[PDB]
Every structure is written in structure tokens, then in C-alpha cells.
Amino acid sequence: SGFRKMAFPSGKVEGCMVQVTCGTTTLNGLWLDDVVYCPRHVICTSEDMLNPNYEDLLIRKSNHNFLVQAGNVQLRVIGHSMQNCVLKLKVDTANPKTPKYKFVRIQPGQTFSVLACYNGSPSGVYQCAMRPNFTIKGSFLNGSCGSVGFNIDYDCVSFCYMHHMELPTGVHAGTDLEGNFYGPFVDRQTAQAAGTDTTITVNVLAWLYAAVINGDRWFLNRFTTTLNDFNLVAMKYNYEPLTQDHVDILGPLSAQTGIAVLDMCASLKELLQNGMNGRTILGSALLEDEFTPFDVVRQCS
Amino acid sequence: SGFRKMAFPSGKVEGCMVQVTCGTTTLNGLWLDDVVYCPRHVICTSEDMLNPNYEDLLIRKSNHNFLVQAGNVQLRVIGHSMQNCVLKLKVDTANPKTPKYKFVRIQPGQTFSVLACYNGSPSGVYQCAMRPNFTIKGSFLNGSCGSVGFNIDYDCVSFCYMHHMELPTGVHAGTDLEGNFYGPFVDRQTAQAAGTDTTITVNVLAWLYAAVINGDRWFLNRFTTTLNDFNLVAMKYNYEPLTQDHVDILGPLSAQTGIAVLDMCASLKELLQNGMNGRTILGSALLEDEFTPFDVVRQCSGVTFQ
Ligand SMILES: CNC(=O)c1cc(Br)cc([N+](=O)[O-])c1N[C@@H]1CCCC[C@@H]1NC(=O)c1cncc2ccccc12
Ligand SMILES: CNC(=O)c1cc(Br)cc([N+](=O)[O-])c1N[C@@H]1CCCC[C@@H]1NC(=O)c1cncc2ccccc12
């Protein structure tokens, strides 16, 4: 028992972290097989960032203009290309520590583990959720670009995020590993306000099921609601509307606990309307929305 | 910016995790050089657990009763011994992925990362604190015994915890890597109770400094308090007494923020008495006590590891 914010073991990703330097600009890269992936803004100077022409900036660089270092050892570049917002550097050798991997584009509300790196060396590993406004509330400092987010399934690493920037509100924005940004953000130094965020309804429901599994059941009530009646309450408290696909994804947790999803929604409605009255759920005084149903299943059997 | 419950990179420890099977029992072992360390209760049947005599039960086993697998490679056991509550199995082959390591016994309130493993496979990593009652509030299922907790200094892994059991109240208990339990617990299926816990004060102060570093300042005030006056309020709300040593280790965070420790203590005193008035600190409606001053510095300055 117990329920913790748990990241995947980072070893398989650590073996892929390199340093990428173009001019004086240096950030982290992801070395998989014979390709190194990193944010394309490594080819920009600070003044370039205000209004970059990435296609022009790329021709004025060359294979020799890229300095890739794997553990203080330099790698040699044999090719350069740009796919959306990621730079791809073909190198001399396939990484011998390349894990079984895929590139995936996650949906908002899905979670993943981030390996925060600086100069190609890891600082820490933590769990994040792709927020409905396509930011993530990460922990990143200057030099962290190129750090990646990932999930690990039975020995295959699914890379889903590469870090590009911190917005003025302190949240983070990035691309998938094909270089397409999550959300409407762009790799330019310009006003880009993230839209207002919302609470991930299905994740909050997943976490309440985790609480019931761990013995917290004071919030269960005898009432029920419909999907439409619940969604009227959700919009009032800035919760994502609940869909039938979300109900189905909670099916495993509803079956293990015997609590129907729309019954749990009735419990959630009361929690939104009345608060918690000085109680906690899984040690939290607030409703937690960065655990997916699959995150709950993994820890809660 | 941002502040997360952040674990160490686990790769170095992942390379040491093996599976240990004795009879119908399988749990995790830690393979360092040519030795595998694991909970000694792997030699017990369920009936043995009610009142085991480990010295007798170990005399009754042999090298061949132990099946050790590192991934898909079987390792052959050439010796078995017991050091307190840990079993030590000498194997023919040294782990080529053995990192620089030490075995340390941590103090209550200190933090570490747990690499949750099952059948020798790492499943997840998270940060936890050694609670003042010498339990940890972990996330563990059946088969997790032998999972280890650790810290990393540059390239050296300091192992400090090996998981042995879940108490009936749902918290977790274990040993250092010399086999000595943290707390008054024993590896026996018998009535056992953890003592009453307290809040780790120096960690709450560290976390408040992390909040200021991240721009949360609404809880700051113009007052300062004395050590004694604070401790009078702290002990009344089940907080650990604040010591001069705790003030000194908070020094870097105090200097980086320009907020004196006893100045922050005035904020903590008001927070303990009055709550947050519907506000949050680093996204939490409660005071967090599982970040040490060193954890805060490591995360907010970008300390890295091999
Ligand atoms: C801060 N400002 C922006 O992050 C930013 C904002 C916008 Br709008 C657009 C871009 N853009 O287009 O690349 C940005 N990235 C910067 C531009 C050049 C390359 C990388 C730069 N950022 C980091 O190094 C960085 C990453 N993570 C957390 C941080 C925390 C503190 C300081 C810096 C970071
Ligand atoms: C649950 N019960 C106890 O864990 C327990 C309780 C007491 Br009282 C004493 C011991 N003791 O003496 O070892 C215990 N360990 C068990 C006995 C034999 C060896 C390993 C056993 N535990 C696990 O497999 C385990 C570990 N962590 C979380 C779990 C969650 C659910 C189920 C099992 C676990």
C-alpha cells in the first residue's frame, strides 16, 4: 500500500544524454542509434531568438559547426537536418546504450517522467502531466533544454517530450520528438501566454479510486449523478468535461473497488461544493489531478 | 523555475538489481562486486515467519537452495552468510556495473530515493524521508522486499535503506545495508507498532525557502522570533524542536534568499497557528516536510550526477 508520485527508472534514458553545442549555445541532446535529437534553437544566438529564420540559420551552419559531447568525449557529425522544431544530427556511431524506443505524441492529461539534465548530465527524475493547456509544471533551470520526458513499457522507452522553454508564468513548453510543439507555442522570444488551465477530471477520479484502495473512503456518499449533471458542475469549478471514453478508461478501477464511475463523480461533486472540512485524501488537502488511471493501476495492483 | 518531488537518477542502482529465489519465495537482491545482499526472510516459509530462528533456518540451507538471476543470466551462489537481518550471497562473478558505493545509516529526517523493484526488475523511483518514528511512507506491494533506498554524491551511490516489510498501518520498515533495522521493528510476523511521528521542522523551513526561491512570498512577514519562542509553538503542533545545527545547515538557503532563518521561523510560526487562509505554497495546501536543505539546493541550482 501507499501512493507516491513515482517516476520511471531513468537508467535507459541516462545512457542517451549528450551535450550539443553550436557556437556558444549549448544544451542537452538525445542520442538514439546514429541520430542526435535536440531543440533547433541551439542554432540561434540570443539576438537570433527575437525573430529567427530557422531555414536560413541552418544553411549558415554546417556539419562541422555542431559539437556533440557524450560524457566529456566528443562525437562527430556526418549529417544535419531539421524536422519541425527539432535538430537531427547524424553521428559517426550508433549509441551502444540505445534502448528499445518509440516516439509518441501524448494527449493532454497523460503523465510521463522527466529526466532534468544540465550539460548532458542528469540532475533528477520526476513525474509530470501534460496540462490541458499543453504546458507542463516542470522543474527546469537555464541549461535544461533538450531534457526529455518519457514512459517505459515492458523495456521499451516511449519518448514523448523534449523541453524547449519556460513561459513567463513559470510553466514549461516543448515538442514531441518529431519536433511539433505541444500547444500553440513557437520557439521564438515573443509574447506567448499559455491559456487558462483546467483540472484533469478523469485523473482526479483515478486518484480518488487510489484513495479508496488505500483505505480512504470518508468522501463516498449514497448519491449519484448523470454525466450531463456532473458536467454542469465541472464547468463551474474549471474541471474538464467528463466523456464516455473517460468513464471507460476508469473501468478497471471501478471494477476493483466496486464503485461505479458516476457514483465517484457524485462524491467528487460533493468535494467540489463542500471542500474537505479539514480532512485529507491520500495525505493531500487538495484534489490531485496528475495521476492517470494507469498510474493508479501500476501502484494499486 | 518550478519545484518537484525529485528523485536521483536511478541508472547506477538499476544495474545492481537482481532476483533472489529461495524455495517458493522470490524477492530482490542488490548485486555489488561478487556479493548479493537481500532480506534474510527470503529463507523463511510463511510458517517460519511466525517465530523464526534465522540461525537454524540458515544452517538448513545451502548454496543450491538460492537461485540468483541478473536479467536472463543465472548467477551461481558460492557462499551464503548472514549479517544481522541481511542475507549475503557470494557469487562467482563480480557485477561489471558495480558503481562506486558506500553503505550509510541515515538519520531521521534525512531523505533518499527508493527504487521500487519486483522480481529483480526496477519499476519506479521516488523520494521519501526517514520519518522520526523510523518508518517511511512509501509505495510498496508484495514482492518489493529488497528494493533499496539511496543517495548519490557525484558518482558515488550511498545505499541507506533495504526494504523488509509493510506494517499493518500501511507504512514501511527496513534496514540499513548492514542489516540493522531502522526503528524497533523485527523481521517476524508478530504484533509490532511504530511510535508516534512528528513533523521534520528543518525540512519545512527548507521547503519554505524553496517557495521564496520560486516567487511565493505571501507568507513572509517583518517579524523575527527567538529559537526558544519558536520551539514553544513548534512542540505544541507536533513539530520537532529546531536546533542550532538545523539553523546552520539552512545557511545557504538563508544567504541565497537574504531571509534569516529566525525570520523564516516567524513565518512558519504564523503558518502553524493560522494556516494558509485559502492560499497554497508551491501548489500545496499543507506544509511539506520531506525536502532537506540539501534537496532544495540540489534541485534549485541544478546539481548533476555521473
Ligand atoms: C526563460 N525564457 C525562456 O525559456 C523562453 C521563453 C520564450 Br517566450 C521562448 C523561448 N524560446 O523560444 O526558446 C525561451 N527559451 C529561452 C530562449 C533561448 C533558448 C532557451 C532559453 N530558455 C532556457 O534556457 C530555460 C529553459 N527552462 C527553464 C528555464 C528557467 C530559467 C531560465 C531559462 C530556462
Ligand atoms: C504485508 N505484511 C508485511 O509486509 C509484513 C508484516 C510484518 Br508484521 C512482518 C513482516 N516480516 O516480518 O517480513 C512482513 N513482511 C512480509 C513477510 C514475509 C516477507 C515479505 C512480506 N512482505 C511483503 O512482501 C511486502 C512488502 N512491502 C509491501 C507489501 C504490501 C502488500 C503485501 C506484501 C508487502
Side-chain angles (χ1 to χ4, degrees), chain A residues 27-39:
Chain A
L27 42 63
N28 306 284
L30 185 69
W31 178 17
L32 299 171
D33 300 308
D34 59 334
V35 184
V36 173
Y37 306 78
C38 76

Side-chain angles (χ1 to χ4, degrees), chain A residues 4 123 140 166 290 299, chain B residues 1 4 14 139 290 299 303:
Chain A
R4 281 288 191 163
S123 179
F140 293 114
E166 173 169 303
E290 292 209 355
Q299 290 190 55
Chain B
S1 80
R4 283 292 193 164
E14 294 172 45
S139 179
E290 295 209 357
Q299 169 163 185
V303 164

Side-chain angles (χ1 to χ4, degrees), chain A residues 122-138:
Chain A
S123 179
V125 61
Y126 54 85
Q127 197 86 333
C128 286
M130 180 57 57
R131 306 300 316 173
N133 68 358
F134 291 96
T135 69
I136 65 174
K137 305 187 326 281

Side-chain angles (χ1 to χ4, degrees), chain A residues 1, chain B residues 25 27 39 41-42 44-46 49 54 118 139-145 163-168 172 181 186-192:
Chain A
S1 81
Chain B
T25 302
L27 43 61
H41 62 47
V42 68
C44 294
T45 69
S46 302
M49 290 302 303
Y54 282 98
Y118 297 91
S139 179
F140 290 109
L141 302 173
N142 178 227
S144 65
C145 293
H163 183 52
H164 287 241
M165 57 192 264
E166 175 171 306
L167 296 163
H172 302 106
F181 262 94
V186 295
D187 48 355
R188 289 154 175 70
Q189 185 61 57
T190 187
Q192 307 181 60

Side-chain angles (χ1 to χ4, degrees), chain B residues 233-302:
Chain B
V233 177
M235 65 149 54
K236 211 164 172 66
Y237 291 91
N238 202 40
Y239 268 55
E240 286 201 302
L242 195 67
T243 67
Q244 185 55 49
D245 185 63
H246 289 157
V247 180
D248 300 331
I249 70 167
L250 284 162
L253 292 173
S254 188
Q256 176 180 353
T257 57
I259 300 167
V261 174
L262 286 177
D263 191 347
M264 192 61 90
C265 286
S267 284
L268 179 51
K269 178 190 308 180
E270 302 305 278
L271 281 169
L272 290 176
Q273 291 170 344
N274 306 338
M276 301 187 194
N277 304 92
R279 280 87 59 83
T280 59
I281 297 169
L282 288 172
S284 174
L286 303 172
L287 304 183
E288 167 77 45
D289 80 335
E290 295 209 357
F291 290 98
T292 66
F294 311 105
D295 294 336
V296 173
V297 170
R298 277 198 300 107
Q299 169 163 185
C300 292
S301 65

Side-chain angles (χ1 to χ4, degrees), chain A residues 41 49 140-142 144 163 165-166 187-188 190 192:
Chain A
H41 66 48
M49 290 301 303
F140 293 114
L141 307 173
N142 175 231
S144 67
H163 182 56
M165 60 185 63
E166 173 169 303
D187 48 356
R188 172 194 165 181
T190 187
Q192 311 182 63

